Design a protein around this ligand. Structure first.
Ligand SMILES: OCc1ccccc1N1CCOCC1
Ligand SMILES: OCc1ccccc1N1CCOCC1
Lengths: 193, 193
């Protein structure tokens, strides 16, 4: 056997497993299946170590997986919070900066502050505000007055952030719905049955 | 979409990934590729969480993976050493107890003591001997006298244990060489080249 050809076959399979795990992570995030998301995330993290060179499409895929991971950890080394880390990933992905990208970005910026207020850490909410940012002065008075349920926070809510991110996840889910591993697995299931 | 049929497709794919990772772990163990073995082991461990019901063949597969993991950690919660744990797995696998099974078993029993002596922990070597076991009295005097290079230890050596386990790994490697994921990955590589 040729070790080089064996290593090449292992790299192709890693690529297939990555797309499968991304598609599975997207569904668990859309469905609210938290433990399934955690298991799929751990699997994707492990599989991604079998790839040392990634194509442009594979890089976009791992960054979507990292993004959804921080968003899922939003309310639960970097010296920043998970939502501030999701914001850094979001602004760096090789993707179009359309209306949806912009509204997801702004919802994360406000939710990175609001999740700290929800947890009762108002000093942390101020530190998050200083790192991200008359609008700023109003937002700073809201945090200072512990006005968690201010109408602004209700419009740029957590549920609205999740709905917008889930709409983006549906496009990713559609784009990868037909990848090799899932398509072959569906055929085996449909043949039984 | 049917969530049940999606979950079934995900279980089929997990089964395929398990066989692929087992075959990859077997090759890394045979080749002495330590970091590749560590990466594949972490991937197999993660993938195995996506299966809650395992067939008789899948159980045998995960136990071979656990066995090779302890053997690989032999010289590096349970209150026993990795080689004593490999011995517990080995004696429990749904497999034939032939001449090869017996010689692998005895080589592990002696190496579980000898690796402690190699590391300079003779008190631990005595604790391992007491847990596993005129032959016993001779083996106990060897440990007590720190006779690490005694002719008995040279016949039931680490290298001999590794060669015997590698011969067993070659049968597993042959049995799984044709599994779905590796066979499809090889076709893509051969078509390029
Ligand atoms: O990067 C691999 C990856 C795959 C899937 C899900 C999450 C991750 N990461 C792990 C650490 O980096 C940030 C999220
Ligand atoms: O059990 C899953 C598994 C798969 C592959 C390699 C090792 C393991 N384990 C992890 C813990 O149990 C003992 C080795």
């Amino acid at each position: 056997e040729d070790a080089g050809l064996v290593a090449e076959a292992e790299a192709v399979a890693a690529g297939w497993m990555l797309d499968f795990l991304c598609l599975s992570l997207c569904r668990a995030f859309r469905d609210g299946r938290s433990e399934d998301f955690r298991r799929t995330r751990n699997s994707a993290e492990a599989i991604i170590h079998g790839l040392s060179s990634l194509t442009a499409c594979q890089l976009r895929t791992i960054y979507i997986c990292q993004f959804l991971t921080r968003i899922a950890a939003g309310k639960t080394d970097e010296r920043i919070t998970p939502l501030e880390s999701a914001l850094m990933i979001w602004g760096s992905i090789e993707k179009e900066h359309d209306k949806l990208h912009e509204e997801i970005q702004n919802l994360i910026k406000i939710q990175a502050i609001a999740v700290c207020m929800e947890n009762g850490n108002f000093k942390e909410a101020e530190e998050v505000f200083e790192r991200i940012f008359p609008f700023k002065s109003k937002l700073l008075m809201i945090i200072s007055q512990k006005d968690t349920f201010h109408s602004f926070f209700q419009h740029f809510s957590y549920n609205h952030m999740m709905e917008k991110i889930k709409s983006y996840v549906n496009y990713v889910l559609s784009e990868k719905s037909s990848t090799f591993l899932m398509k072959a697995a569906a055929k085996v299931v449909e043949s039984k049955r």
